Amino acid sequence: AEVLNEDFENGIPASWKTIDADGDGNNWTTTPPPGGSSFAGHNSAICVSSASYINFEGPQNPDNYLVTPELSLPGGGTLTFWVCAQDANYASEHYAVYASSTGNDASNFANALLEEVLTAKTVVPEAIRGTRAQGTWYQKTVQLPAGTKYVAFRHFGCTDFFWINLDDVVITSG
């Protein structure tokens, strides 16, 4: 039974929450600057994205969370989602996925269930990035413990690549 299935085609839903932990005003977003329109989604128009580098601005130091609405997983569940680097040639974005059994603030998200740096399969030094191919979309699977109330996706601990993209977040109970 699916308890969450988000394609982002109507943007980040109001039921989800962004946390700008570094405080720069830049978040996970479906309107990445300076274009202000979503990057190409996974077999779809829209995905949600966070920047380590913004064209016409420069390197960023993100600590950005994207948090689900409150979940009921009394016996646990399974998360799947799709992730890619927006620029296949500046691919090395660092992210983690966390579960909380209580609240939905940054301090509630500790002990990553998954933490990785996307694999660079190709590389280029350019001021304007995102000018070639998107990275490959990869599906990830994370098991969620019983009593998980919130899942957070965190883009952090990296700078000076381009953007990380997320799409097609599905959580099933059991």
Q: Does 10 bind Na ion (CB under 5 A)?
A: no
What b/e string do you get for 135-170 counting C-beta neighbours within 10 Å, with b at 16 or more? bebeeeebebeeebbbbbbbbbebeebbbbbbbbbb
Give the count of alpha carbons within 13 A of 132, CB side only. Answer: 13
Q: Show the site string, 101-140: x = touches Na ion by CB under 5 A, - = not.
A: ---x------------------------------------
Question: Is 20 flagged in the annotation as binding?
Answer: yes
Residue type at position 85? A
Q: Does 170 bind Ca ion (CB under 5 A)?
A: no
| Residue number with CB closer to Na ion (5 or 101) | 5
Tokens standing for 47?
């995905």
Q: Which of 19, 28, 32, 41 binds Ca ion (CB under 5 A)?
A: 41
Q: Does 17 bind Na ion (CB under 5 A)?
A: yes
Q: Does 149 bind Na ion (CB under 5 A)?
A: no
